[PDB]
């Protein structure tokens, strides 16, 4: 039994981060940390042997057997450190191949916003509110409304032009759903700009 | 370059049905491995083998059956699909000596959703919501949006194409699609995407912006028997025009 910090976890771009879990089992000798990217396969990043800790660039992986303790650090997040990180224990040899893997921990590195100009746009047409342009101190939360959608914040690089930007978007087919309410149940910031 | 590959990609099933599911390598591996996991939740090990036909169970193996016919290939397969074998499922591969420290080499996932009335599949309904003027003025720039709607099963992969070429820049799609009714077990989902261009690049009236959504459903040898549309595996889209 492998216990995984079973977050989502959610960071600004250069923090560190740290990955954890704990197990039961003492016989566990090999310590592995794999990737996993949004609908994708699990792919192997870092593995050490017993107690002790081993370094490979921005990355840290750490074992401590006597406390059943193990951890994954990354130094300077980067966006594309953005997805589901597992970890997977086998016991010494003889193991026949076998892992055990944690429930993994999803993270989402956000990345940083030079220019903000927040704003609400409402697109043309069952209608479509577009929250854009606010920097990563910004969370989007879920409408108190069960006939309004929201998807959280989504980054898009237009990079010919050297420009990210954060968007949210709100959609709801109800009778008194407008792009002045659309955002209520978010703490968004106080410049942001609703235009007619 | 050399790898672990799964097939099909994608399955849809009626409870009682069969399937098989193929994993195969050219990377000589003696360990091959079948895997089954469970939205935001880890890798349960269904059957494992050690080597050319021999298999041994994991921690999961009851309503599976596997074959390992040869080295480069290990079958997976399902007698009388159950919905709790809705899942996303993962073939991996390793030398018995190895080389990467205990760590194995994945596939990129197999989607199997086992449902209870095929009366409950349906494809996405797709839409193109046009650039804000306000956008256009205060930025210089257009977000366009596609909304994919009331689709059933959640198999599904959105694409932008601006004069018909698939473009990258610029794109913004949510990681997974969400529930439009979250207390149903069966609801049907959403998915939303977002298109960023120059305000002067949506200006051009020839521009052409199409948002694509390819469905995985209902196969020819499934039968049908409702007023509407078949809801086999295809494509949906909406499109929109540069406006001056």
């Known amino acids: 039994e492998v216990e995984q910090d079973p977050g989502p976890l959610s960071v600004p771009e250069g923090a560190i981060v740290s990955l954890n879990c704990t197990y039961s089992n003492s016989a566990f000798q090999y310590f592995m940390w794999y990737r996993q990217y949004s609908r994708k396969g699990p792919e192997l990043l870092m593995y050490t042997y017993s107690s002790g800790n081993k370094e490979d660039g921005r990355f840290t992986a750490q074992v401590d057997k006597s406390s059943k303790y193990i951890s994954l650090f990354i130094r300077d997040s980067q966006p594309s450190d953005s997805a589901t990180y597992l970890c997977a224990m086998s016991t010494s040899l003889p193991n026949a191949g076998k892992s055990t893997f944690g429930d993994g921990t999803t993270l989402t590195v956000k990345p940083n916003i030079q220019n903000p100009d927040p704003a609400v746009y409402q697109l043309r047409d069952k209608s479509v509110c577009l929250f854009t342009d606010f920097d990563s101190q910004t969370n989007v939360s879920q409408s108190k409304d069960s006939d309004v959608y929201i998807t959280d914040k989504c980054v898009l690089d237009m990079r010919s032009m050297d420009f990210k930007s954060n968007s949210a978007v709100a959609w709801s087919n109800k009778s008194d759903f407008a792009c002045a309410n659309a955002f209520n149940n978010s703490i968004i910031p106080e410049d942001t700009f609703f235009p007619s | 370059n050399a790898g672990v590959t799964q097939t099909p990609k994608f399955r849809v099933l009626k409870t009682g049905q069969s399937m098989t599911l193929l994993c195969a390598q050219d990377?000589?591996?003696?360990?091959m491995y079948w895997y089954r996991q469970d939205p935001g939740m880890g890798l349960r090990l269904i059957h494992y083998s050690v080597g050319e036909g021999t298999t041994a169970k994991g921690e999961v193996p009851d309503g599976y059956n596997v074959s390992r016919l040869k080295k480069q290939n290990f079958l997976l397969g399902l007698e009388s699909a159950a919905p709790s074998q809705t899942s996303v499922y993962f073939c991996?591969?390793?030398?018995?000596?190895?080389?990467?420290?205990?760590?194995?080499?994945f596939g990129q996932g197999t989607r199997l959703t086992v449902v209870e009335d095929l009366n409950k599949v349906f494809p996405p309904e797709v839409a193109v919501f046009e650039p804000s003027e306000a956008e256009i003025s205060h930025t210089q720039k257009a977000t366009l949006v596609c909304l994919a709607t009331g689709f059933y099963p959640d198999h599904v992969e959105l694409s932008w194409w601006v004069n018909g070429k698939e473009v990258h820049s610029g794109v913004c799609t949510d990681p997974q699609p969400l529930k439009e009714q979250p207390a149903l077990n069966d609801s049907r989902y959403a998915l939303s995407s977002r298109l960023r261009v120059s305000a002067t690049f949506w200006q051009n009236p020839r521009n052409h912006f199409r948002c694509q959504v390819q469905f995985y459903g209902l196969s020819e040898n499934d039968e049908w028997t409702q007023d509407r549309a078949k809801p086999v595996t295809q494509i949906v889209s909406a499109e929109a025009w540069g406006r001056a």
């Open positions: 991996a591969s390793r030398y018995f000596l190895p080389t990467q420290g205990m760590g194995a080499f």
């Open positions: 990377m000589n591996h003696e360990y």
